[PDB]
Amino acid sequence: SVWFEMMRVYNWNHIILLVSDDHEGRAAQKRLETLLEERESKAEKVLQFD
Amino acid sequence: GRDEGCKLVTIGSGYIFATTGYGIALQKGSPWKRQIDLALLQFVGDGEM
């Protein structure tokens, strides 16, 4: 969310999600998409793996 | 359509004209845009419009 606040710092909009884990990564993706709904934007590509 | 005697009739149906639409003006940065747009798509999508 502070990183979403970083989208208020440098006015950056084009982001890519990369998460190694799976449990916390889904909730982080949910929170990030909830915040990106406010600017009506989305991340480019979400990534989860082993 | 309410002309007395149906005298005053336009030419064509806007073929040689601008043919624009109407909308709801929101301020640049208003978070209400997506809800209003999906509500308009719902109002057209059921014949309520």
Instruction: Find out whether A49 and A20 touch, Cβ atoms under 8 Å.
Output: yes
- Resolution in angstroms for this experimental structure? 6.3
Beta bridge partners, A19, equal: A48
Distance from the Cα of B39 to chain A's closest Cα (Å) equals 16
Beta bridge partners of A48: A19
Structure tokens at B47: 């014949």
How many angstroms separate the CA atoms of A16 and A46, rounded?
6
State the DSSP code for A20.
S
Tokens 């909830």 correspond to: A34
Helices (H), chain A: 2-9, 23-36
Q: CA-to-CA distance for B34 and A40, rounded, in angstroms?
A: 7
DSSP category for residue A22: S
Place of tokens 């982001």: A15
Say yes or no for a CB contact (<8 Å) between B34 and A38: no
Joined tokens for residue A44:
């480019």
- Gyration radius (Cα) of chain A, Å: 11
